[PDB]
Design an enzyme around this catalytic site. Structure first.
Site, short mmCIF file in Angstrom:
data_model
loop_
_atom_site.label_atom_id
_atom_site.label_comp_id
_atom_site.label_asym_id
_atom_site.label_seq_id
_atom_site.Cartn_x
_atom_site.Cartn_y
_atom_site.Cartn_z
N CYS B 8 0.74 -1.01 -0.13
CA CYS B 8 -0.06 0.05 -0.08
C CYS B 8 0.80 1.23 0.03
CB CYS B 8 -1.12 -0.02 1.19
SG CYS B 8 -0.12 0.39 2.85
N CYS B 80 -3.93 -0.72 -2.32
CA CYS B 80 -4.42 0.40 -2.40
C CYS B 80 -4.64 0.80 -3.79
CB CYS B 80 -3.10 1.49 -1.91
SG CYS B 80 -1.57 1.06 -3.00
N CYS B 82 3.26 1.97 -8.31
CA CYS B 82 3.67 0.70 -8.06
C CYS B 82 4.97 0.13 -8.83
CB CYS B 82 2.51 -0.34 -8.10
SG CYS B 82 3.09 -2.06 -8.06
#
Lengths: 129, 131
Positions: B8, B80, B82
Site C-alpha cells: 500500500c 491501495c 507501483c
C-alpha cells in the site's frame, strides 16, 4: 513573524498539541509548523482534547520532517525525548499516546499533557513580549 | 513457501492488516511481507483491531518497498488504489477503503478499521482456499 517548528517522533500528538497551542497564544506573531521523523496519523484523542478547549483542528496533518530539511526556523523546539535553526530548544513531555487504558483513562493523560504544553507555551510567549 | 508481498502507500494499515491476516490463515505455507511506497508509521488503530482478533502485532514495522524490488515474490498484491517487480510471478490488485482516512472520534475510526479488517480477512480466507 518568528518561525517555530515543533518536532516529535510521529507528528501525531505532542508536536500537534504544541502547534495548535502556539497558534492560539502567539497569534500572528509566529509562523508555526510541526513535523515528525516518521509521520503517522493524528491521534483522535489529540483532536478531542484540543476541541474540548475550543481549539480548531481541521488543519492538522501528521507530516514528515524530510521535506523541511532545507528550511530555516528561528526556533526548533523538540518535544520528544533539525540541521538549520537559530535556536534549538528541548521541551520533553510525556508521550500521551504511549499511555494505555480505556479511552477515558487515556484522554486523562492527553488532557494532562495538553495542559502542561499549554502552560509552557503561555510562559514562553510572555517571556518574549 | 509461497511468497507474498502486500503493498500500500504507507505500510501503516491495509498492507499490515493483510500481512497479519495471511500469516494467521495461511500458516507456514506462506512467506508474507508488507511494504509501502512512502513508509510512515504503523497506525495504532491497525494494531488495536488486529489484537481484538487475537492476532499478534509486536513484529509489525512500517517499511519502504525499495529494498524488495528485485525479490522473487509469487504474488505482489496491491491493496491501495507501483514498482516493477521483474521476479514477481503474479500481480493482483485488491483495492480496499483506506481506514486511516477516516475522521471522527476513536470509536468512529475504529469502526472503519474493523470493517476493513473484516473485509481483508474474508478476502484472504477465500484466496487461501482458491484452486
Amino acid at each position: 513573524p518568528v518561525s517555530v517548528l515543533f518536532l516529535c517522533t510521529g507528528n501525531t500528538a505532542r508536536s500537534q498539541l504544541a502547534q495548535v497551542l502556539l497558534e492560539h497564544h502567539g497569534g500572528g506573531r509566529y509562523a508555526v509548523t510541526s513535523a515528525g521523523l516518521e509521520p503517522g496519523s493524528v491521534n483522535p484523542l489529540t483532536v478531542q482534547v484540543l476541541q474540548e478547549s475550543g481549539l480548531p483542528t481541521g488543519h492538522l496533518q501528521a507530516k514528515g520532517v524530510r521535506p523541511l530539511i532545507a528550511e530555516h526556523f528561528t526556533y526548533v523546539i523538540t518535544v520528544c525525548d533539525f540541521p538549520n535553526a537559530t535556536y534549538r530548544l528541548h521541551w520533553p513531555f510525556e508521550d500521551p499516546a504511549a499511555a494505555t487504558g480505556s479511552e477515558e483513562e487515556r484522554l486523562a493523560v492527553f488532557r494532562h499533557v495538553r495542559d502542561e504544553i499549554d502552560a509552557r507555551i503561555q510562559a514562553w510567549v510572555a517571556a518574549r513580549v
